[PDB]
Scaffold this active site. Structure first.
Site, PDB file in Angstrom:
ATOM      1  N   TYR A 174      42.745  41.009  28.776  1.00 27.92           N
ATOM      2  CA  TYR A 174      41.813  41.606  27.827  1.00 27.92           C
ATOM      3  C   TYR A 174      42.013  41.327  26.341  1.00 27.92           C
ATOM      4  O   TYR A 174      41.044  41.322  25.584  1.00 27.92           O
ATOM      5  CB  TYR A 174      41.781  43.120  28.064  1.00 27.92           C
ATOM      6  CG  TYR A 174      40.998  43.489  29.304  1.00 27.92           C
ATOM      7  CD1 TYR A 174      39.622  43.700  29.236  1.00 27.92           C
ATOM      8  CD2 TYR A 174      41.612  43.536  30.561  1.00 27.92           C
ATOM      9  CE1 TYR A 174      38.868  43.940  30.387  1.00 27.92           C
ATOM     10  CE2 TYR A 174      40.865  43.774  31.723  1.00 27.92           C
ATOM     11  CZ  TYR A 174      39.493  43.970  31.622  1.00 27.92           C
ATOM     12  OH  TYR A 174      38.730  44.165  32.750  1.00 27.92           O
TER      13      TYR A 174
ATOM     14  N   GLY B 228      41.835  39.773  23.115  1.00 31.22           N
ATOM     15  CA  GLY B 228      41.116  38.664  22.513  1.00 31.22           C
ATOM     16  C   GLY B 228      40.139  37.960  23.436  1.00 31.22           C
ATOM     17  O   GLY B 228      39.599  36.908  23.089  1.00 31.22           O
TER      18      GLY B 228
ATOM     19  N   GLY C 238      36.853  38.264  26.657  1.00 32.71           N
ATOM     20  CA  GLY C 238      35.690  39.029  27.057  1.00 32.71           C
ATOM     21  C   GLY C 238      36.196  40.133  27.967  1.00 32.71           C
ATOM     22  O   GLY C 238      35.695  41.258  27.942  1.00 32.71           O
TER      23      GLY C 238
ATOM     24  N   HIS D 236      40.773  49.449  24.148  1.00 30.32           N
ATOM     25  CA  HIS D 236      40.079  49.196  22.890  1.00 30.32           C
ATOM     26  C   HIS D 236      38.657  48.704  23.179  1.00 30.32           C
ATOM     27  O   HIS D 236      37.700  49.098  22.505  1.00 30.32           O
ATOM     28  CB  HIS D 236      40.853  48.156  22.074  1.00 30.32           C
ATOM     29  CG  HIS D 236      40.273  47.891  20.718  1.00 30.32           C
ATOM     30  ND1 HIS D 236      39.439  46.825  20.461  1.00 30.32           N
ATOM     31  CD2 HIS D 236      40.404  48.559  19.547  1.00 30.32           C
ATOM     32  CE1 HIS D 236      39.082  46.845  19.187  1.00 30.32           C
ATOM     33  NE2 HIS D 236      39.653  47.888  18.610  1.00 30.32           N
ATOM     34  N   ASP D 237      38.523  47.842  24.182  1.00 32.36           N
ATOM     35  CA  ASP D 237      37.216  47.321  24.566  1.00 32.36           C
ATOM     36  C   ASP D 237      36.349  48.474  25.083  1.00 32.36           C
ATOM     37  O   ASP D 237      35.158  48.552  24.778  1.00 32.36           O
ATOM     38  CB  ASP D 237      37.368  46.250  25.649  1.00 32.36           C
ATOM     39  CG  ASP D 237      36.034  45.690  26.108  1.00 32.36           C
ATOM     40  OD1 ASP D 237      35.751  45.754  27.323  1.00 32.36           O
ATOM     41  OD2 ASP D 237      35.269  45.187  25.256  1.00 32.36           O
TER      42      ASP D 237
ATOM     43  N   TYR E  32      35.060  50.429  22.174  1.00 34.17           N
ATOM     44  CA  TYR E  32      33.937  49.761  21.526  1.00 34.17           C
ATOM     45  C   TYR E  32      32.673  49.895  22.373  1.00 34.17           C
ATOM     46  O   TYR E  32      31.580  50.091  21.842  1.00 34.17           O
ATOM     47  CB  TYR E  32      34.258  48.282  21.308  1.00 34.17           C
ATOM     48  CG  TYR E  32      34.938  47.978  19.989  1.00 34.17           C
ATOM     49  CD1 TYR E  32      35.705  48.942  19.329  1.00 34.17           C
ATOM     50  CD2 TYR E  32      34.827  46.717  19.409  1.00 34.17           C
ATOM     51  CE1 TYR E  32      36.340  48.652  18.122  1.00 34.17           C
ATOM     52  CE2 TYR E  32      35.458  46.417  18.208  1.00 34.17           C
ATOM     53  CZ  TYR E  32      36.211  47.384  17.569  1.00 34.17           C
ATOM     54  OH  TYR E  32      36.828  47.074  16.381  1.00 34.17           O
TER      55      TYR E  32
ATOM     56  N   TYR F 277      34.706  49.381   7.670  1.00 38.69           N
ATOM     57  CA  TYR F 277      34.946  50.780   7.366  1.00 38.69           C
ATOM     58  C   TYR F 277      35.983  50.846   6.253  1.00 38.69           C
ATOM     59  O   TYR F 277      36.326  49.828   5.649  1.00 38.69           O
ATOM     60  CB  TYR F 277      35.464  51.497   8.623  1.00 38.69           C
ATOM     61  CG  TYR F 277      36.578  50.755   9.334  1.00 38.69           C
ATOM     62  CD1 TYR F 277      37.816  50.557   8.719  1.00 38.69           C
ATOM     63  CD2 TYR F 277      36.387  50.225  10.609  1.00 38.69           C
ATOM     64  CE1 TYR F 277      38.833  49.847   9.355  1.00 38.69           C
ATOM     65  CE2 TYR F 277      37.398  49.512  11.255  1.00 38.69           C
ATOM     66  CZ  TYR F 277      38.619  49.326  10.621  1.00 38.69           C
ATOM     67  OH  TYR F 277      39.621  48.618  11.245  1.00 38.69           O
TER      68      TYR F 277
ATOM     69  N   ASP G 122      40.223  51.169  16.401  1.00 40.72           N
ATOM     70  CA  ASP G 122      41.163  50.191  15.855  1.00 40.72           C
ATOM     71  C   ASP G 122      42.528  50.818  15.577  1.00 40.72           C
ATOM     72  O   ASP G 122      43.565  50.231  15.893  1.00 40.72           O
ATOM     73  CB  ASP G 122      40.622  49.592  14.549  1.00 40.72           C
ATOM     74  CG  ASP G 122      39.461  48.631  14.768  1.00 40.72           C
ATOM     75  OD1 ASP G 122      39.001  48.035  13.769  1.00 40.72           O
ATOM     76  OD2 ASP G 122      39.006  48.463  15.923  1.00 40.72           O
TER      77      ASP G 122
END
Ligand SMILES: C[C@H](CCC(=O)O)[C@H]1CC[C@H]2[C@@H]3[C@H](O)C[C@@H]4C[C@H](O)CC[C@]4(C)[C@H]3C[C@H](O)[C@]12C
Ligand SMILES: [Ca+2]
EC number: 3.1.1.4
Length: 124
Positions: free
Chosen positions: A28, A30, A32, A48-49, A52, A73, A99
């Site tokens: 995962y 970096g 898809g 993290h994915d 998002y 941000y 993040d």
């Protein structure tokens, strides 16, 4: 935004290497994303994915080219501690915290060199 995520990572992990950005890690980090994460660090990237993906599902949030990585941000770094500015808007705040949590997750997970640039078609 992506560049800020990289900045947070340097904040939480001062000794991380810039050239690592050229590489991917596990299933995962970096990528898809496919299959199941190979270790704790890779799990941080999958989480993290998912973070998002949840953000994109917010009917109230729209991102440039539907990519949360483009969303800039405001955050600050102090003694390796990351802080998301309270004045970020709701969508930016969600991304900032995704993040932030990932950066912290990374700083605590073991780095396994064998998983760098993994043969995903075979192990993912
Ligand atoms: C912080 C961590 C460990 C570094 C170390 O011990 O030297 C490294 C290992 C693989 C790295 C990830 C991979 O290089 C894949 C992505 C590369 C992008 O440029 C940043 C996000 C990205 C998702 C990176 C986040 C972070 O820099 C990782 C998760
Ligand atoms: Ca913004």
């Amino acid at each position: 935004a992506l560049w800020q995520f990289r900045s947070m990572i340097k904040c939480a992990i001062p000794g991380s290497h810039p050239l690592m950005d050229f590489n991917n890690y596990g299933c995962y980090c970096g990528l898809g994303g496919s299959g199941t994460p190979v270790d704790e660090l890779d799990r941080c990237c999958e989480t993290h994915d998912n973070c998002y993906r949840d953000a994109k599902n917010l009917d109230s949030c729209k991102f440039l080219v539907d990519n949360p990585y483009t969303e800039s941000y405001s955050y600050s770094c102090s003694n390796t501690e990351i802080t998301c500015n309270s004045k970020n808007n709701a969508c930016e705040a969600f991304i900032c915290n995704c993040d932030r949590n990932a950066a912290i997750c990374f700083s605590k997970a073991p780095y396994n060199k064998e998983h760098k640039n993994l043969d995903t078609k075979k192990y993912c």
